[PDB]
Design a binder for this molecule. Structure first.
Ligand SMILES: [F-]
Ligand SMILES: [F-]
Ligand SMILES: [F-]
Ligand SMILES: [F-]
Ligand code: NI
Ligand code: NI
Ligand code: NI
Ligand code: NI
Lengths: 837, 837, 140, 140
């Protein structure tokens, strides 16, 4: 066959389309992903037949699926389907624009090539949100306020078109434009940033110009007017204008004035909030729906000065001497700017540019060129040597940190980062039974091997040893070898003697302890494990207890001041299938028999609707501080972020806004919940100064999301300032977006680049020995610290300490004497609209 | 399921077969690739049923597809389909020989297992070339001319068969052959190289022997006659013959003589051109059709001496003391010989062996053993320590060099090398918006990361910085950091001040500048960008301008002496879909709106049938010197080579042979066009002494092609003398060729081998600092040089400088006052016959 | 005495009888690069504030008498990345004539004082028997 | 075995060798004035040779470690250029494995007078007043 890579991939695309076709043919209403697969396959298939032109297929592709053949969100999510195929005249790109345009598709075309029977239209079974929609006040913003302004008539004397962008220095324009150049001096177009004015040959247009600001220095263009704006340079400029034959005509009566907040000022340019949000993403007071959830984030503040947005592209702001600075030392250029980001972080929901430098978040604020813009700090300068990542219309969050990882296989790593996880903490050696059961890398030789093994992967890693020992001796060894924590597990013994010894070791090494308690109550009840803590900081894994712990009341630890409690993700949130699914999973994990009374009694003591219901409420009120995966050992590595948001959405639907919430937005609840997979894991494990939030000085581990896929499938995952993984389409295609679009590894995964972007977290004892040198590690190593004086009060926005009781017979859970109930949800968002399977 | 790798792949093969089956079932005539997929799947499926033997399936597989169910080229391209499957008696290999043998296939068998309705035969819709066919004069060649000859009767006294190859020293044969050993001394069989004479027990055959030549030294075999051929060694040999009991009988009247050019000489052996080409590939005067194009390459010269071809295999020439030399110092053995290559290169279309040593092309000429062959130079010796790559019947070219690469994702790299690209020049950091738009690695920290990232990939890389600056300061930094070029782009500002500053920097650093000019004419028209060049060397990207530049006349730069102009590939050549496809692509890239008059006027100023038509003609006459991809930023990384050949084929069909062409072949046009993706990119960017042609002293970056897939899908890509990527079939199979055959990475991609085979091109400033040491790079680094005194006259075979005018209203293009028109093509070769999608 | 000698002056080589005459001098009298307190190579004076950081010399040897088979001359010697970058008149183009852009002394430039000294290429001994390491030290 | 070999003049045997060869390369040797026309003019001193420069020393030698240490590849952990090998076969040794020094006399020692006997016979030797390999060779 001699298949090239693209042929192999297109076969894959075609198989997804055929799955979508079979589903269509029995009357399924296709989700977004199925609809793309089908339309894109059908375009390839029509191309194979050789009878349809590109222009014909642009039309045919909008006839394939009707509103009634797809889910209600599809016409909203789906703007275009692109694919390339071999026509009789070679590879061509087809874009099918707005493909869901009719009520009913031409199902014979939708099914063309499939040989499937065409279903009758009544087979498709009969209100819905717009995922990621932007809500805006009906209002206009005023651009470039507080500047000198002039209106000039500009005539083209050219025989070819001339188009001039918002931030081009107007005196430097093409000599074949004629206008008052003296009055254009130090001025630029008063138009939306990144837009342009077009002059066809011979046209006259009046334009409004406003003065450049900041230090007011002109650079670049034709070097007509190069230099700081002042009288001497104005004269030199006009001399060059005449000398060089640039068109000039005095316009003695050109109106002059200022821009001001005033809807009647003839110098003003205005832009409606709706269009401002389409161009730049939204600004203060606007709201954003997160994915297809019910949660609304309001922008709390915006660093932008309207009119001076850093937008990159042809005609646009980020160009030599315009938005791109010519007046600063080379060493202070940013490495990268992410322009116009909506930042969602536990510190706030804001709108800002993000400066990246040496792999770090260098600055958050207003970026660009101090020579023509106000408000640009000297750590947010965009220079020749700066890359641009376009954040307009996107949300940017910290990368997620999963601190309950079982290192069972390498493939969960890939699964984790393609979902927005950039830091893994846990243990394991691969799929050994010890690892399948517990987050433990037991042997110093395995700690070495795991660190060498993961050294080129672009994520930060922490490995935990086996803390289940009554003696300190071996624990010192695994910690010196590189352990940044220890994980006590009932499967190796979580008895009071092990607990206490392990904690004493933690006190000495300044590492965090993670515990899965004694389910069996063999050595004690939960109050006896709490007594063995002796007041010392400890992290309780899966605190609700389905994933493990004192039956049935381990969840009591959520009221214990020196406990940092996490949830694992598969109980998040309580839904219709949760209990059946979890009971059987437990029986599978434990090799239990439904026909043995004691086995079934064991399982029922462990899988409990009431504690799991309580766990929804505890998360919501901030009494559980972290969500984590338990990857392949009861939980799901790619669902840390989506389970978090599904819990918030559930609690909002059932209990309404939090106390602390406003009633126009869900900001407080959003900040509380994002903290669960960002900052709190980093605090708990002792590395919050490096990662876990969008804050200056930290690693630029950042994730980009479309609001419509927020919480489910990110656009791109940035690791230490470089793209590590991202959605990208057919590698052979003319552009990056034609099908199949898949999450794929990027340059941050090749060679040893991964190590240059990341940190392996180890203990102090290990770094004092320079384990990184001993082990020939290319990844940076840092020691975890400051984890032995933590309490629940240090968990950001999840510092609640209700007194928790659990009836030992009925399992009823109460917090400060009140029932913790929530019914099961029958559906969750961030699922059916997005997943192919 | 416990799927092993082969099971996963066979599922893939089966899915391709089922695609082919659905297509068959609606009446599609299958292309070569679909037909292989279907036949191979059906063989597996019949094997699964367990009722058919291997021998039955060898027969059944020739009944599946008729001539009417496949495209006209399929019976020519398809010689055998092989696959292995699990029969009731375990894995077996089935080869279906010559599968298209009937008019009409047994479509119920073709569809067996599919549950698809069997289409009636009238569903398949009704002159064609043989892709890669060899055209030969009807003539015989004479072997081994100018040698002493003898005819000896040889009788087997053995009870088992004895077969003796063309270049075995005849006195050393099995003792159980009886003949005149005295007259066999220093002689070998006068038969086609690599063939053999078989002696069944008791048989007598007369054979013609000719003397060995070169230094005439016998080595190996039975050590009967070891040593230089002379009287003393003859006597020693006959003594050993008698002593050792090797069969000998004097044949007093054996005819003796010489070989000579003379059709009547009874000592001569002759071979028809057709068979000589089947065994060795073609020789002087023969022609080869390139793929399924209309282009014919004639072999201009051949280094072979007929009869002494280096052919490797059982019985064959390359064996101890025969074609494989025992008389030379170990250090002068070749590392590898590619035997019997048709070389297509801008320097000529020739037939030669290629010697490889230390990763370099060591020699091009006649290889083998100077002890028995004439004409073997001491740099083309095949020794014990030499590997063989078989080039007979194949074409060998330099690896392609794409010098407009946007480093948008790693996957385009794989796409590039699997198509025959071994060198990438461009810029980017991954899928950042800056990179998606422009070939720029802006930051020194990204230059470091990109070099580390690509350090183990087996291709040569050059990275370009952002040259769009009016100040030199930051440009010095990105160049010192490793930039081997700078890419000025209108999206960062391509104004005269940036242009001039960037060029002044180039003058100092001896790096090439690549430019995408000011489309908008914002700062000037094309004549104003040309004035800003001030006569200095510059490379204009996508010179025709659809991919970007002064609207609408950027293509004028093709007449500018100090301009090195390239095309990008998606406008190559003008076909029926080109304009519709490109207009919409531009609207997608620029986020433009069909409903806004200025937007559509912008697009129509940019996407122009007349300039694109002109661009076909300019390429053809050598006024555009390079073709390049623009990978994922308007162009296609895997189509650099095929778009080149489709342009040549188009121009030949429309305008006939070039002036400079003979009328029996297309050599001149072939040499002109291959130069576009080989030597000229290397000259333009300053590294032509390392790569860019099949010439002694350069890196052995070489690609092997079947003539029938020339220009589309290569056999194997050799990187610095080692196979980097190659077609290979089922990894579990008994041989390398059973389905699925896919282009796959080879040993040159594992460990750090990739770096040992390649070069990262950097600036002089960067190498003076030893950036390779600073950055811990394993790949070799060399500095680019000699790019600041280049003009169009240095572009090999593409040195035309017509004066170009462009009507600013109608867009009509003229070269020296003559219209440049060509109509659109409705089809192109190198597409439909080859691609699955 | 201050700068070493200039065109037409002669120098006796060691205690031999051989006299080297300076054949030419790149200096413009008055603008010699001399480093020390009160001296020429100081911020914004002989030491340039107007050029890109990457084009500062690594080191300048100021006022060298060069003896070489190519000629006996008087010049500053610019060093950059371990290479002889330029030979001529060094300093600051913002206050001096004749300073080429490859002989700029910047903040990031070291000074070696050549005034009154002769500068030659290092010698190359091409008949060395590598009998012990100590002859290496003796040689350099 | 490793070519760790020492060269001696018979007249200085046992006192001052000519040259010490380490893994086949001269490591240290008598050599005279490094500037001299030949290798032997005064002062002749024992001096380090090429085997002591750069990392050559490691290419000529072995660091002996335990089996446990080599099983962990301590040489890699510690970035050692010297070869490492594990010692072995030392737990079944007796005096009988000491080459030419395998005597096992029964030894008694009077605890008061300290008289030593081997198989019941007095072990006496008077003190020597002089020794060879001293006064003829040493400067101090
Ligand atoms: F678990
Ligand atoms: F767990
Ligand atoms: F482009
Ligand atoms: F481009
Ligand atoms: Ni657990
Ligand atoms: Ni777990
Ligand atoms: Ni371009
Ligand atoms: Ni491009």
């Amino acid at each position: 066959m001699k298949l090239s890579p693209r042929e192999v991939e297109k076969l894959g695309l075609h198989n997804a389309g055929y799955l979508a076709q079979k589903r269509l043919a029995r009357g399924v209403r296709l989700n977004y992903t199925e609809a793309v697969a089908l339309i894109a396959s059908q375009i390839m298939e029509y191309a194979r037949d050789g009878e349809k032109t590109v222009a014909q297929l642009m039309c045919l592709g909008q006839h394939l699926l009707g509103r009634r053949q797809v889910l209600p969100a599809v016409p909203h999510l789906l703007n275009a389907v692109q694919v390339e195929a071999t026509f009789p005249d070679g590879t061509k790109l087809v874009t099918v624009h707005d493909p869901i345009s009719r009520e009913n598709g031409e199902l014979q075309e939708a099914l063309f090539g499939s040989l499937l029977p065409v279903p009758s239209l009544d087979k498709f079974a009969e209100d819905n949100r717009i995922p990621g929609e932007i809500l805006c006040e009906d209002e206009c913003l005023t651009l470039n306020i507080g500047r000198k302004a002039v209106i000039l008539k500009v005539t083209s004397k050219g025989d070819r078109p001339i188009q001039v962008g918002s931030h081009y220095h107007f005196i430097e324009v093409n000599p074949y434009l004629t206008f008052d150049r003296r009055k254009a001096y130090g001025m630029r177009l008063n138009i939306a940033a990144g837009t342009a004015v077009r002059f066809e040959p011979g046209d006259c247009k009046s334009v409004t110009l406003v003065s450049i600001e900041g230090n007011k220095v002109i650079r670049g263009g034709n070097a007509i007017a190069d230099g700081p704006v002042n009288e001497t340079n104005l004269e030199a400029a006009m001399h060059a204008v005449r000398s060089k034959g640039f068109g000039h005509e005095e316009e003695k009566d050109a109106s002059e004035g200022f821009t001001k907040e005033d809807p009647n000022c003839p110098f003003n340019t205005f832009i409606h909030r709706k269009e401002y949000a389409n161009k730049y993403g939204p600004t203060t007071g606007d709201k954003i729906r997160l994915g297809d959830t019910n949660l609304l984030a309001e922008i709390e503040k915006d660093y932008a000065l309207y009119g001076d947005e850093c937008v990159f592209g042809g005609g646009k702001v980020i160009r030599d001497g315009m938005g791109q600075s010519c007046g600063h030392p080379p060493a202070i250029s940013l490495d990268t700017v992410i322009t116009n980001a909506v930042i969602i972080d536990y510190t706030g929901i804001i709108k800002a540019d993000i400066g990246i430098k040496d792999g770090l978040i260098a600055s958050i604020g207003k970026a660009g060129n101090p020579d023509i813009m106000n408000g640009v700090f000297s750590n947010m300068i965009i220079g020749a040597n700066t890359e641009v990542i376009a954040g307009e219309g996107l949300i940017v969050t910290a990368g997620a940190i999963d601190c309950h990882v079982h290192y069972i296989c390498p493939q969960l790593v890939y699964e984790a980062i393609s979902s927005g996880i950039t830091t893994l903490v846990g243990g394991g050696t691969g799929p050994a039974a010890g690892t399948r059961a517990t987050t433990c890398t037991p042997s110093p030789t395995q700690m070495r091997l795991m660190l060498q093994s993961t050294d080129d992967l672009p994520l930060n890693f922490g490995f935990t040893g086996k803390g289940s020992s009554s003696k300190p001796d071996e624990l010192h060894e695994i910690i010196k070898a590189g352990a940044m924590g220890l994980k006590l597990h009932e499967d190796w013994g979580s008895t009071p003697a092990a607990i206490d010894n392990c904690l004493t070791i933690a006190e000495h090494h300044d590492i965090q302890i993670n515990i899965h308690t004694d389910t069996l109550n063999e050595a004690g009840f939960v109050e006896h494990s709490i007594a063995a803590f002796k007041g010392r900081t400890i992290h309780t894994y899966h605190s609700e207890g389905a994933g493990g712990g004192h039956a049935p009341d381990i969840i009591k630890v959520c009221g214990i001041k020196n406990v940092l409690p996490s949830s694992t993700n598969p109980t998040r949130p309580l839904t219709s299938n949760t209990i059946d699914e979890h009971l059987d999973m437990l029986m599978v994990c434990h090799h239990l028999d439904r026909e043995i009374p004691e086995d079934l009694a064991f399982a029922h003591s462990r899988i409990r609707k009431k504690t799991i219901a309580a766990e929804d409420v505890l998360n919501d009120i901030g009494a559980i501080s972290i969500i984590s995966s338990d990857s392949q050992a009861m939980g799901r590595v790619g669902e840390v972020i989506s389970r978090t948001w599904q819990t918030a959405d559930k609690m909002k639907a059932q209990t309404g806004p939090l106390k602390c919430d406003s009633s126009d937005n869900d900001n407080f609840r959003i900040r509380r919940y994002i903290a669960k997979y960002t900052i709190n894991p980093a605090i708990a494990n002792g590395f919050s100064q490096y990662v876990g939030s969008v804050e200056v000085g930290k690693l630029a581990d950042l994730v980009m999301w479309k609001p419509s896929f927020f919480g489910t499938k990110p656009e791109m995952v940035i690791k230490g300032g470089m793209v590590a993984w991202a959605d990208i389409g057919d590698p052979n295609a003319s552009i990056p977006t034609p099908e199949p679009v898949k999450m794929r590894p990027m340059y941050g995964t090749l060679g040893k680049a991964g190590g240059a972007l990341s940190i392996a977290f180890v203990s102090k004892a290990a770094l004092d020995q320079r384990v990184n040198v001993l082990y020939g590690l290319n990844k940076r190593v840092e020691a975890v610290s400051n984890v032995r004086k933590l309490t629940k009060l240090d968990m950001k926005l999840n510092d609640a300490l209700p007194e928790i009781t659990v009836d030992p017979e009925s399992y009823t859970v109460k917090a400060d004497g009140k029932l913790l109930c929530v019914s099961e949800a029958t559906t969750v968002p961030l699922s059916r609209n997005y997943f192919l399977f």
